[PDB]
Write a protein that binds this DNA or RNA. Structure first.
Length: 135
RNA sequence: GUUUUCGGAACUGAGGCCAUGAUUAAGAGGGACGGCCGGGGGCAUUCGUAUUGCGCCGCUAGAGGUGAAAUUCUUGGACCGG
């Protein structure tokens, strides 16, 4: 079922935290990244558009993710936090910090923390006009 | 008839005092030369992520978008991860 090898050591996964300003993704996956353990977003925890990116929704999603990973044998997590990136914003959304803190607070062990938002060497045009969005 | 040069007219064969004759080198300009310098220009040639598609590998059935006023796919698997 799970790795019951060397109970005294850590089993490491990778948590890809995608914190956009619309909602937040808490995605724990294999060490290589190909196999996924569980992905719980903030939108499957709140029934309203606005709170999809809220810190509370991210805390709930991270709690469920950590519960599933603990019941699946994974004990420690490497963090790969990303914002939307591209030509859009590079600042992580409101739920990133709360998701990370909820992962740490719910009995998970944190490994290396890395920021992986996609940064262009230079990009295509942004979705706004030349005068920007005026609201 | 014929009076060659002393107040003129052409073919110019020789030589000499010419103090023999070219201002300077613009805190003007042009040009040359020297070592550089610059996202200056043209041609060719490399590289970088990002974005968008496409093919594979893993699910709740959600993601997008705006302070909750919607359009936008779906046991045809979106978003996400590789």
């Amino acid at each position: 079922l799970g790795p019951q090898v060397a109970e005294g050591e850590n089993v490491f996964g990778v948590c890809h935290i995608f914190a956009s300003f619309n909602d937040t993704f808490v995605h724990v996956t294999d060490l290589s990244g190909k196999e996924t353990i569980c992905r719980v977003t903030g939108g499957m925890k709140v029934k309203a558009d606005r709170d999809e990116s809220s810190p509370y929704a991210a805390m709930l999603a991270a709690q469920d993710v950590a519960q599933r990973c603990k019941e699946l044998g994974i004990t420690a997590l490497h963090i790969k936090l990303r914002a939307t990136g591209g030509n859009r914003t590079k600042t992580p959304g409101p739920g990133a910090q709360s998701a990370l803190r909820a992962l740490a607070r719910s009995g998970m062990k944190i490994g290396r923390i890395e920021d992986v938002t996609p940064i262009p060497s230079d990009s295509t045009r942004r979705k706004g006009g030349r005068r920007g969005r005026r609201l």
